[model samples]
Target: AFEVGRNVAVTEGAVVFENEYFQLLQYKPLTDKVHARPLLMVPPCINKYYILDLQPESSLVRHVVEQGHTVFLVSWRNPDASMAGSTWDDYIEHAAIRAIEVARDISGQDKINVLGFCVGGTIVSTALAVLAARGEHPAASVTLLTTLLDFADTGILDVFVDEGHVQLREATLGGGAGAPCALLRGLELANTFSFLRPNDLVWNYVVDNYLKGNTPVPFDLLFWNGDATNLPGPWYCWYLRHTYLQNELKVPGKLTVCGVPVDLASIDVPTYIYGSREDHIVPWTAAYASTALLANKLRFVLGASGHIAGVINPPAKNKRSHWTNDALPESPQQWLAGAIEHHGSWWPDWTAWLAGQAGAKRAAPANYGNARYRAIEPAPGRYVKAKA
Candidate 1:
């Protein structure tokens, strides 16, 4: 019943940069002074970016802007025939790396803070690794939420991704023989994610709405969840075989991106990583395994609830709890045993850590973009508005 831009993604901003793959949004800072180093967020392409800005009351994007940080986010283009030929390397080169460069250039900062959520984390991490291989350290600090760098244990979704399934997809939709490069349609992606927690997301709705004659309540998160995204067949195929099936990303120089050997350990930066204890897609342990792969100053925090609820928790609501242990033991279980439980959202802890990485504060920018990258449109741009 509620519209996206009007009711949910109401954060005010402007599109500063645009490419065939995505658009970069520069959210207007809410304070007079802003951090010297800007923050560029890479949200999962399979979902919409508005998850971070679902509502003003709980919007992480707004919260970061209010914290006096210049925030920029990548709003991925919904793939069509034009992007069907795109591959994983194209996304890393054009979408993630390009976004980082644009944000840095626009902010006039040598180093900027970067964050990645879910699969976006994987893309950003890969892009960072590629940059590291090229003898460049672009990010001062990196934050990963509900992300899996080492796909050793992918939890419930593991059962569905084997060689047979991936091969089937490759043949049918991944540009094999008769099949041209195509889209892994949005609806199909949405269904798979929903069924991962069928009892809560699917059956419960069916029973309550159909069997019991009850009208479903309108929830912003659910509305956002229903808004899906299409992934290029080649890109999806590469991701499936490399990260999830073969598990090559964690191995040093195991994968080559944009003609460069990528190693996660090469990127030396402070990192704040978060995992949801009950996340089905990116399991907490799989997320914790990032500690072993990335060579950096690492701080890991675990939050309560499942994927969406756990991540969308804003401090004001004061509903869920989080756990923190300064020392990251060899195993997730060990870390949990030593963790101190704190009731409330982990957003403050993350922001506090980010403040150290952010350079000294300066006057907020008077305009959205520079002369070269002029403002194209208001934020929550046309790309986000495009339907699959």
Candidate 2:
């Protein structure tokens, strides 16, 4: 129904860097003069990056570029047999931190702005903490959309995660299932997410295709939703145990990644945190939990709708609403009590806040990459093209 590079991730750009795990894509500047600080987007590895670049009308990537800011995005590789043994540290160091460095190197900016969505937010925040532990602060500001820093309440999805379930996966998926490491099939992952809201994603499709004898609509959002990526068994196991089971990510220095003690507070920079008011995967309250965890300045916005729709609401549509409040109360309920409802998408609000973090406007780079990091290929590169 929807083509990937043709119309979905159709943003004009070039691939700046590539590794075994991920590719870094740098978009062409839409304006002659752009912000000095480039924006690096880290999207969830479990899904295709095209979700954020669905179409020009609703494309977050296109909108950000048009707003006079340089943009770079990470396209993670779908795990294969060779990458089966990959762990959480590999994602944070090789993919997230490496992408950040490549963006900074290409733009020649001392500091850049980063936006991470879902698990990508978790990866970005973890990467920043690791960098801070190494005495480096490369990001001027951070934006997290529908992310969970403290996994106190994971909503309905919590039903599937427990000691027995995690251990079963660790043995079979992670190790001792005829191999040292295996893959959590992308299709299985997609099915689990769909079942989280069976009525909307599953039964509706079934009713339309079977009962009504109708051909599925060519909806871009649905197309993106169908595209999924495999996660390495070892990495998935580590994530499940450390985050959902034990909930150690919220505790400072409790876990070590890339041989560095991680503390979210040490990544001290102004942050813009957004939560979907009705998100089921990472509950709104869980997203709000980040406000109390991070150090320095913070601004939280609550968008209407579920996880995907809320964050992807483009201002052009003017379809939904968002709530905002300056104060950050300890309790999510208290924060919502004082929040003001505003009609329309939250994209403009986020852009305005992002601009403040971006440095002074300067002439956009003549080319995609610097002398060192040459352009590898066109944007929405080969990594995203790989199927699980």
Candidate 3:
């Protein structure tokens, strides 16, 4: 496990099911009986899902399992040349929606608590909106971790949301309608992210890796970051034009995903939105904008540190604290003004909130996977193990 998995995604879990697009993992419970309603974790397609289950001690999935929640995680495939033909709708329907339905049927639970991380959040949120439009009530509550639903304030990435860049992508990758689809190389996407924080992620590595002739200490996060994933031409261009450039996800009926018009307000599930105060990719205030768009109860929390560090924070480390405010005003500034600072990781607070809405919990499950979604393989799955 250490040799191949790098001892990162070696956390106790079973690959319940696998498809071309995603691998569904049912984490082994750390408790006696699990919650009746299962919890589905959707990670950013750009990276492996193990970021949430990095190690036993610092793993969010492990902690949630310990809390007696039946957790199902989506591990997206590292795309290849053949997957280039896939559109945004293909991903939303076949990947996200299919997994959600599989999870629901497998667990025999009608409603599941869903959490989306980074771009994965965007996919799940869109899926939930589409599901609501179709009269499907699979999601009981939703949580977005550093998710950018409103791309108006997309920090350093804003520079790429222009016509010139979009046109360049369309020309290079055959992105426009009827254009022959192509694959966006993993290195290209990796390079774009590395330059987002040039000094910290790029130049520092150059100095250490190239000049010093020293190897970087093996860190799981860096390992996953290096394990980049290729993007489909159609989906990449569609995302760039609709969200970043047009800011269409927030507008009702402005866009259609998977044949259903997306209206954020239609998703009535209670939501918990998280953002990092020091995030350079998706700003904290921008994440807070989700509360104004969505219906029903929503709680927004701001934590310390940048994008990766902030979200990967486990309860064991008291290093970086978080802020929470009950009042989610129209303006993010108002929420910040009345916010209360809290010590330690915000995982406990989230657990409590989840437990409250998760309904009456029975004893935790003894084993991983149900009879229908029987364990197919041990985690982390082959897709996550695949190289870029």
Candidate 4:
């Protein structure tokens, strides 16, 4: 470990069934009492999964685990040249669905609570649809953190979806058909103005870390963000073309997984959704679209920060705000208008919501497993070691 402060304990491993594509990490509760249900967090394969459990205090995973809930997160394999041809179908089947099964088997639970962030949110939405169509409702509840189920009006992100941006698609899919880290970096750059509102991230970092050297970098969060990975090319193409461009997944008959049409309305499980007001990736309106399609008991929360900061919020920081509207509005805008604003982080509220979904909480497991799987060292895992 880099030895910087602000670390959180977690267990990391690759899905045993699949060798190359799937990886995951779990944040176990400090206590020995484990909840009846497990919360399976599916993160965007485009980014590292550690973002959710960045720091102990700020970690959503830790909060859930501490609230007497089991937390499991899918950390996608960093794509390589051999995996270049991986497509959207591969991600849905091999990665997302398989991860769900793995969590179910590991936790020894009949059903799991599925949650997704960003692109992972889209994948989970599709997976839920498939499961519902097949009458396989292994997921007890669904939570979407800054996820967008509908891209019909993604607002600012639309600028990159137009014709001019499509031309760069070929270069993004290097060689045969996988997305290189460079392409992902370029997409990050496209949102420069939005992310770097007051000052550029690079310059700000330089001034704060190199020049002034006033503040020390948080080891866990820095490591996770630095450990970025590449996405498969075919997967990127499918997402951009089908989901973003065609908007096929949102509509009922257009998209199907394993011969089953993905219908959002089929998701009847209780749901919790969190969206960011300043999120440029998935506009707030698009995030709220999830509520409109699902028939589940829902709780929609609006956080007051960008995508990353919004979700990583912990109570200790006391630098954020969240709004919750008891009455579900017909639209996202109206919901925000009528929602009650609360100060401090949204973690507590989310934890309460999640705890209720978990039903009655129990003692944690005696052991996570044998020596090899034994809770590695505490806080930051080896995978998060940042190389500079």
lDDT of 4 by residue, 58-107 (tens): 66666677677777777566666667777677778887887788778877
Error of 1 at 107 (Å): 0.8
Off by over 4 Å in 1: 155-192, 195-218
Question: What tens digits encode model 2's per-residue C-alpha lDDT throughout 183-291?
Answer: 4422224322453454355675774465334544335655666576777777877777778767888899998889998899999999999999878877888999999
Better of 2 and 4 by lDDT: 2
Stretches of candidate 2 off by over 4 Å are: 155-192, 195-218
> What TM-score does structure 1 among the candidates reach?
0.88
How far residue 255's Cα lies from its native spot in candidate 4, in Å, is 0.6
Work out how many backbone clashes candidate 3 has.
Answer: 6
| Worst 10-residue lDDT window, candidate 4 | 185-194
Task: Report the C-alpha lDDT of model 3 over 74-141, residue by residue, as the tens digit.
Answer: 99887777676777888888888988998888777778899999888999999999988898879999
Question: TM-score of model 3 relative to the true fold?
Answer: 0.87
In order, what lDDT does every prediction score? 0.85, 0.85, 0.79, 0.68
Which pairs clash inside model 3? 32-364, 33-363, 33-364, 33-365, 34-364, 34-365
